[PDB]
């Protein structure tokens, strides 16, 4: 009973950051070094943990969240950051215990959107799919797009010849929870 890390990493379609996908991982074994020793990721920073000890640890549940994002925006997928992605799309908690994995995705991904308008910053692990027209004044917008009345999601214009900073990157955030419950994900 190996863990389906394949089904998330090697997947054909990734989701827009604003509507990121979450895979819950449970009742399985997990070689965390088929991932660390690959030389196929450009970003792989771990916060509450160290990858070497990951095959010597058990966790109640593991969550794998995935989406696409610009290269210059992978920096926001860390605890304590601000910016349009961290604020309105995907927020990591200050007290985060997990791993953030990204790789360059230009060959497969060059549609994807992100949320540009929200009145307040997102809470950690909040997911806002709302496509309500955004109210930037005191006048109601009524599904009508116009002055003070903006569509909340705009498109990444992913275009293969842009510099690495504006090229699509695929990201997987591994969240590791320990609860007072029978562990089900054991590295070995």
């Amino acid at each position, epitope marked *: 009973n190996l863990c389906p890390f394949g089904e998330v990493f090697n997947a054909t379609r990734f989701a827009s950051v604003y509507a990121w996908n979450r895979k819950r991982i449970s009742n399985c074994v997990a070689d965390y070094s088929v991932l660390y020793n690959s030389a196929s990721f450009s970003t792989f920073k771990c916060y509450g943990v160290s990858p070497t000890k990951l095959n010597d640890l058990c966790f109640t549940n593991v969550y794998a969240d995935s989406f696409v994002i610009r290269g210059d925006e992978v920096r926001q997928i860390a605890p304590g950051q601000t910016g349009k992605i961290a604020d309105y799309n995907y927020k990591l908690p200050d007290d985060f215990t997990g791993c953030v994995i990204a790789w360059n995705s230009n060959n497969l991904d060059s549609n994807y959107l992100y949320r540009l308008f929200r009145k307040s*910053n997102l809470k950690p692990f909040e997911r806002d799919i709302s496509t309500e027209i955004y109210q*930037a004044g005191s006048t109601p917008c009524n599904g009508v797009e116009g002055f*003070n009345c903006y569509f909340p999601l705009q498109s990444y214009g992913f*275009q293969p010849t842009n510099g690495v900073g504006y090229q699509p990157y695929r990201v997987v955030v591994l969240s590791f929870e320990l609860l007072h419950a029978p562990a089900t994900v054991c590295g070995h």
Partner: antibody
Amino acid sequence: VQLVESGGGLVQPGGSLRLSCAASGFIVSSNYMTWVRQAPGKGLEWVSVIYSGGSTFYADSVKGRFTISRHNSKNTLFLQMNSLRAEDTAVYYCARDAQNYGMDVWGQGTTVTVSS
Amino acid sequence: DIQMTQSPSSLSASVGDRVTITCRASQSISSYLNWYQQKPGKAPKLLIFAASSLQTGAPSRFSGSGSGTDFTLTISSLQPEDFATYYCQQSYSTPPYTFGQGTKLEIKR
């Protein structure tokens, strides 16, 4: 639908100054509010922006000395200009950035002169 | 990091002309380009957003066109009130803002 700026003047290098911008046809706390300056005979350079959710960002020539901020009570946008240098001499504008839809409400412009 | 290049720094033209200003970008920014007018001593007005949409209150003779890295602001018959400086703005990666350096319209003579 207007932005009314204020608070420019003469100060001397190393001094301090506080610019204010009052808003009529929208809610400043619901919007991206940007500060833009223009030196004599040059173009528009960015200075500061506040995000609707609170996050603030700054032009590299300015970090650690200016502070963008706002009081919801009054739709008023503020810029706190500390440790001024002659560099900073220019006309300052507030503007509402509707991003895709463009920067559509601009201030009159207030003039900031730094000289000894 | 996305640099804007307005291409004629100065364009001299006559009342009645079809004047075409251009703008140029460092990256394909799709159609996230805005266009502005500024008369001397005054603040900027937004003319065209989203490369081709006309701002409300902008006159009909103003039109935008472009996608990718090359864009155009076109005035179909120049009126006297249009001698000014036109700036372009990108809105593709906007927390660092960049504007073009300007195109000034003089009177041909």
